Design a protein around this ligand. Structure first.
Ligand SMILES: *[C@@H]1O[C@H](CO)[C@@H](O[C@@H]2O[C@H](CO)[C@@H](O[C@@H]3O[C@H](CO)[C@@H](O)[C@H](O)[C@@H]3O)[C@H](O)[C@H]2NC(C)=O)[C@H](O)[C@H]1NC(C)=O
Lengths: 49, 49
């Protein structure tokens, strides 16, 4: 709908929003993975003992 | 103060000729670029004169 010079602004807004969403998702996943790793270590210790 | 409003639908619009007609002193589009109008589709177009 827009020529490149005008489109760039909307494209940048979308890029910023989606990058923020991806960063939030990845951070949440990292924290959840740390929790699951703690649980897995506990389970491994439970097995071994 | 009594600007006249006209409705246009059920037709094919060739904006190329209108844009190429240099008789228009000001030809300014905001939501869409003038060039791309020939490729878009609209539910209906209002013309206020
Ligand atoms: C309002 O009237 C004017 C004058 O006709 C329109 O401008 C241009 O008028 C010509 C002929 O009426 C349209 O066809 C032209 O034919 C010549 C060959 O005779 C050709 O060399 C031109 O390139 C053009 O195809 C033309 O479509 C039209 N617009 C242009 C030249 O940009 C005007 O279109 C009329 N307003 C509306 C909304 O139609």
């Amino acid at each position: 709908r827009l020529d490149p010079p005008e489109a760039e602004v909307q494209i940048d807004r979308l890029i910023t929003g989606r990058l923020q969403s991806l960063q939030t998702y990845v951070t949440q996943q990292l924290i959840r993975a740390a929790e699951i790793r703690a649980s897995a270590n506990l389970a491994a210790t439970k097995m071994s003992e | 103060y009594a600007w006249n409003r006209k409705r246009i639908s059920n037709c094919v619009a060739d904006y190329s000729v209108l844009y190429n007609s240099a008789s228009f002193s000001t030809f300014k589009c905001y939501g869409v670029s003038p060039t791309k109008l020939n490729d878009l589709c609209f539910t209906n177009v209002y013309a206020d004169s």
